[PDB]
Amino acid sequence: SLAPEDGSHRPAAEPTPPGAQPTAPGSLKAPDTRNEKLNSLEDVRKGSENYALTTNQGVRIADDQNSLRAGSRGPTLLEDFILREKITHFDHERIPERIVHARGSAAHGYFQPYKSLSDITKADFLSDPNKITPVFVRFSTVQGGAGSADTVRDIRGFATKFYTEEGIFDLVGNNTPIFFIQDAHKFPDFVHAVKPEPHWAIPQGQSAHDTFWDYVSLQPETLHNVMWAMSDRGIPRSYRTMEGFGIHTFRLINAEGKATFVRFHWKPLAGKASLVWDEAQKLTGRDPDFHRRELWEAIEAGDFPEYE
Amino acid sequence: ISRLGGPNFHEIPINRPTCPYHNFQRDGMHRMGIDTNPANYEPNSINDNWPRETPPGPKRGGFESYQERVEGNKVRERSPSFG
Amino acid sequence: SLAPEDGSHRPAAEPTPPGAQPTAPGSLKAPDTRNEKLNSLEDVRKGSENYALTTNQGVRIADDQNSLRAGSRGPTLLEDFILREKITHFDHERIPERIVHARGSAAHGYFQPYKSLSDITKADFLSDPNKITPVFVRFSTVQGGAGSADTVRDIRGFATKFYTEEGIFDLVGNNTPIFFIQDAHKFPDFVHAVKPEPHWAIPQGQSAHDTFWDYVSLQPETLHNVMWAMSDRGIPRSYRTMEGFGIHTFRLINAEGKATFVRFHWKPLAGKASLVWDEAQKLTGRDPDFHRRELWEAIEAGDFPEYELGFQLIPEEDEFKFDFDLLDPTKLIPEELVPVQRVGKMVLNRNPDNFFAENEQAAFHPGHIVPGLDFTNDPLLQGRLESYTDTQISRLGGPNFHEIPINRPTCPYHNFQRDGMHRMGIDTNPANYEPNSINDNWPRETPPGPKRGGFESYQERVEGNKVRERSPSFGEYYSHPRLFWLSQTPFEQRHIVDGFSFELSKVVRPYIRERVVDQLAHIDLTLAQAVAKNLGIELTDDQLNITPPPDVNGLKKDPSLSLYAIPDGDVKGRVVAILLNDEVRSADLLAILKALKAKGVHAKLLYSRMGEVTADDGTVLPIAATFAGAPSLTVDAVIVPCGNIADIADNGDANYYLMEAYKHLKPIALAGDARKFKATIKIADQGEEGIVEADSADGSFMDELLTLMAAHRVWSRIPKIDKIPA
Amino acid sequence: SLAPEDGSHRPAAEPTPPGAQPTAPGSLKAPDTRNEKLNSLEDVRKGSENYALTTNQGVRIADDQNSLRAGSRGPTLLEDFILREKITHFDHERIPERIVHARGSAAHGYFQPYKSLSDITKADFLSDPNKITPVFVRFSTVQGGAGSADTVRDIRGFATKFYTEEGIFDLVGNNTPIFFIQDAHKFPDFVHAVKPEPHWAIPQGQSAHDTFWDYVSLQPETLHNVMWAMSDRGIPRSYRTMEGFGIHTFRLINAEGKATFVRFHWKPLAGKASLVWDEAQKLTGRDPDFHRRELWEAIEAGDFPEYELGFQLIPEEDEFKFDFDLLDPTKLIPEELVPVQRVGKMVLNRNPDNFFAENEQAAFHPGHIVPGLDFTNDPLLQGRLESYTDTQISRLGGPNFHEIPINRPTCPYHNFQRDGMHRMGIDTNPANYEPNSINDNWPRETPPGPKRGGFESYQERVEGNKVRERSPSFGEYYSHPRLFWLSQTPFEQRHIVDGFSFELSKVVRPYIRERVVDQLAHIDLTLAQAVAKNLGIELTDDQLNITPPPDVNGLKKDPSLSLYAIPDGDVKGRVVAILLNDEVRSADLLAILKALKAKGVHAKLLYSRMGEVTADDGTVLPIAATFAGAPSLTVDAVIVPCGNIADIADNGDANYYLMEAYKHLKPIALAGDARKFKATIKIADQGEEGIVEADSADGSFMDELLTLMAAHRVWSRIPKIDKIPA
Ligand code: HEM
Ligand code: HEM
């Protein structure tokens, strides 16, 4: 045994305030929080306590500290299949990050309607207030990589996967009610302009550079979302304290075939709050994981993010 | 790695062991197993060092290579016994 | 035409100091710079001016502003093949980042040896002082993603690709002379421990978290390199002002077959220089791209990064002559015992044209050696050889990554390998195997020889059983950490203590802190007690009584291990903030600029807004940045000329600018009424060492300031900064 | 291990007939055959002679025969970087095959139009009879994997990539003028049905299995192309002897903006010619590479495949004037209604250098059109535009597949797309977006115009509600199958009946056979009855009473739909087997070879062993193959010269060769005492049409033979072949 005698290595599996316990995987922290989707993941969840260390092929490992070599100061041997699998898996851990919204922080939850909407939509998840729909939500920035900072000035993504009884519905929104551009054909132009510039790949997580403002100056359609990004909207205090929007007009269709135009909104029950610019910038250096930490610790504390 | 798309090919159903498999390897394309271990390295105290190494033994022991003596210089040479 | 009439969109294609022009692709910025590698990339360089906009299939596009739809407010149509190509290429832009060292910044240059080293190595690139070898060098951090910040505390990588006439040689090193671990089998464990923790993927770019210090506390082999990381080595000022090392002992092999053990060194010709922690951490917020930017801007300015290649050479018969094992990569070889022999110079003199094509896709691998070099049994080096080709199969999409332009040898390559994803080369050989008769056995093997021969490994004797066992000779963990500690100045020691103290304060589980404190007590008691006190930990009586570890071959210190014990300052390429006011005394600015120019020191002129201000004599002075825009973090010193000081005396940003610089130990110079700013930093009326002051900015005002800059920081200010609220 | 002293390991770089020299890479076989695209590949062609064997990093290899090991009987060492690179490249050679048309064979050539088409199209490649456009063509089967056989019963693909001055145009067609299905949404259902069944992955290269005929029986829209597949069109003699069709109606657009509907045709100048089924199926075993081989060898011989591009042109105002919908890809446009206008000629005159790099990695996509061409609403064409780019992202490893050398345009290409796996192009443009001012907006959009303009789609009127609905005009399925049936000769109809009968006899579930027979009864009662009789099925009274479908716009037949109704035979490039004996009469062989050479017909000299035989006058005759080694399946006709006939008269294989040739309707010519072989094929002292016979092989004998070969096969023999046991 390497754990301390007093058990202080293991966090209590009860809600606790930020900093009170080490944070933990959600099924260890809150084992009795359940929804249909979380339960359905049980077939692939893997524990660890009391199990032998093995290869991926199920062969028990005697010595996970040394490679096989000819003599204890000798060359490493090709026949070390244990070393080879371990290093091979490590060598292939990374997958491409998302082209945009690479930096993001996610949690499980659920949604329930306040009333049946069958007069305006036949969508099953909206048919009955007693219909509980598991969700998985990912909040994100837009421009920076998966390893960039959270409290940059940027638009924020707000993506919800509804696991409904009639299919997955993904509501893939942002935290402002419009976008920068009108036609998808210009998306790679706008995104290349805001992204790090191609010669030197600077700057990270920032619109504050020539190519972004070159494009905005030549494309006045951008100016509306640019106003939002330049406001304190661009620097939320928390993903719990920003609005979400679908941006596009969609349609709801009812059982009679009637179409109603709809735009979607998420309204934060913790209210709206943003940082100020100097605080946000400095916070990217003192804690580049500030939003990711805040969201995880809110959920561990029982301060569940709620949106209407 | 190319034929089967990455290092998690042992999670393709036909290739899965029927016996337990636990270790500190993570991620990779197509990762199916969701690890709950607080630790992804050993030695660790945060999960009391589990999953743990197992000494070799008569049954249910860890793998140890037979201690064959090696003696020779580093050569790219075919043994004359093969000629 | 959307460009301005005056041509101010286009940067001057000549060397200009940082901030004077927008930065540009290297071949546009410096078209006259050339080497054999840069010339050989010309077949894949693509221009743009005066060309039509096309699809990738070469069809001219008429409207690149709209999708094809049925009516101008109608649905988009599947037949829009121009939209589909453009969006599909965009959808697939990203490739996996490197598993480690994902954050990095690279440049082209060249290397030349000072003399032939044929008596010790038959390596062709070291055979002739006239033989110049193109290089491509990538510097990096280790832990963070490609989008993480530059000025984190971490080790730095220093990887050099030599495009030699007898093959590519990759010297894949770090900025410290040892690694954290002894056997490659533990690399996934150590890297998992230092990386973001797997539940929540925090923290980025930081070792200040529980799992890292858990691993360290359980693996005392790691303490050597941890001491380095906790020192100011872990926060270099610039990639130009850090050392590089190969870490492992390799071999040189001469034409007579004699092996000599070698360790590789890079010496920064700009000297050694690091930030201080608060400055580095803040700087990850104010400019997470600071090292990448500084490297690119140095090259655009002609402040080319220069390093000297050095070898520590140990005869084969001296393998066992030291107190430590030469093959143990957690041990360094003290320069007091084995000096570094100067080998040649490398100069980095051209930025890439495209970051993704040249930097992101570059593949380095320490297995890439050439005749005249060879490996040893260092068991961390041994395992590296399994990883670097492997990882490139997924990262770069298959086994033809050597055909990506940046990676291609400049020398011939021919073999029987075929196919693979993204195969470029079209093989005309009738044979794809050997031995063959049908192409008269070409291409053919080449016997080894003095020059231009085939690769043969040194016939080292191997004897022992097949074991998974650490050599007992590696099982000593404290003597080298102690040598390192005792070799540091007292302020460098303070900064080490403060690095461990800050990092362990972020460890949530107190027992892990205690366990690390126990480790430090095995290294040096003064160190352990000082960290313990910062943590409210009391050493036990047993801890107070641990015998320190022995010295290393009789050495009680080695000043070559310190950044600053032996001054090696160089001001060329450093930068000074000049805080402007609305009525600057022009004679002060003239003297300042003249002195800085003469030593190759750059300036940024700062004010409370952009635009320009006008001096006492009518000189129009353009403003580079605001005080808040370009914080003191980003320069090496601060000068405030005389003039209408009342204009800025109550500016919070201007006062803070000086407080932050003061805190971070930077030289500050105050001329005439700018001396009023002494009060904001609590400077006594008769002055103090490190603050330059006079009635005007000269006679001796600039020499004094530039003398302080040559010593980098004002270490004697340290006792003073704790009282200052900044 | 070297080449023979006599240079016999190396083929002559001149045109040579099949079998005369070993085959070789096109650039070594025909170095002086050039075109712009072939030249442009020179940056990546790699030679081999006189070069050292290296790693891919350019390191010379000394011993390519052994791994590094600790002693010569010891374990292999991890540090063997040479072994690791060689094995890793081998381990990653394979890429996914094409989801369909995986089996295919390709060549380079050129195209030119006969006259400018500027009246009807502004496409640059059609604008001038003296502007030559390089092409790369791949022919293919559909169902089978890359390693399946060539002479299966299937549809064939005929894809041409035109490297034009205004972009790449891919005309991605097949060898029949319609497809099986109407809407791309069904493509995966139809292809899954035809492909090997999912439980056991059987059968390869065959539609003769339950799932295909289950889908056909339930989807009568498939019946037209199924008729073509069951006819001898499904088993071509060569890719040189089949038609090509783009299938869909496209648009041509002229400089005045006028749209003309068009269907694309390729006419084979070597004439139309197919195998018979027993021959084609046995040939998949004796030489599964027969079509690949025949194409490569034709090009090495100078028998370049030539095809005439032709257009059926329908004015816009005539869109609705037929009794079928022009946009329905299961309907053909009969040439009796709309003639094919001759447009230009394409000649395939050089083989690739490396099959993988050039053939396997080639990417064709019918969305790659150029100004002057446009799409229509054909709902199968429309869906194809979503597939060909998408599939290339996994097959070829990412979105930079246009930089794989074979796929590159020869014309300029410039845009703002960046990055992606295996990015070759290093972009110098300061901008990677438009509009931009920093590169004065280059590269720039180009307005549409008469020549060199940007692409603009024809502004077709769209009016309808958003529906997933098949157009009612597409709901007719029997009239085109009937037209096709009625346009075949009686022997072609017999072969169709036999194809259906053979395939349905392999369907295990008898109700599926019954359902198919019921569909055939809606096409033609004579066809339905003949297939039913072979299946032991009896048509019901109701089935006998099904009213046949209407004529197609009054047509009772169209002979352009037959392979053979109109003679168009060309013997150049065909091959005869000459069965030797050990004392051949040299005067026969002289006359035979002289007459064959005059018409460009090749010969293969066969015997019962390899080596040589000596003729009556001392001429040494090298033997190409044994009777068993090169069966009659591989030749067009068989000649037996006089000589020592007793040598071969009782040889089983020699007799069998003639029995198999006879059965397969090939001409056979017997000179002098070789007429003794008439008895093996049971055929009369008076002689038989299709058997040439004389005292010696002279002018007359050879003219008769070559006349029979110009008619391809001896159809009048069919009633005589059921009694021969072969
Ligand atoms: C109203 C406008 C848009 C909104 C609100 C929006 C929102 C988002 C969000 C929230 C994500 C991150 C989902 C996650 O967390 O994984 C995302 C990802 C993405 N978006 Fe959008 N987006 C918009 C426009 C576009 C456009 C016009 C395109 C391209 C035509 C595009 C292409 C993508 C792509 C390629 C990704 C990465 C998706 C992945 O890897 O799974 N987006 N978007
Ligand atoms: C002395 C110890 C080591 C040093 C000095 C070192 C140095 C480096 C550097 C500088 C890079 C970045 C090269 C670049 O800029 O692209 C790198 C990448 C990498 N290293 Fe190491 N390393 C060490 C130990 C190891 C070990 C023990 C392993 C695994 C057994 C390993 C595996 C890797 C991998 C997988 C990459 C990513 C390479 C790629 O994607 O191209 N390293 N190393």
Ligand code: HEM
């Ligand atoms: C008239 C109908 C069609 C014709 C004449 C046709 C013709 C062809 C040909 C000749 C090729 C092989 C090109 C080569 O040699 O590489 C091919 C490939 C392919 N086709 Fe089609 N096809 C048709 C319908 C479709 C449909 C409806 C789809 C899907 C909607 C489709 C999807 C594909 C795919 C995925 C490939 C593999 C292409 C690649 O890997 O590069 N085809 N087709």
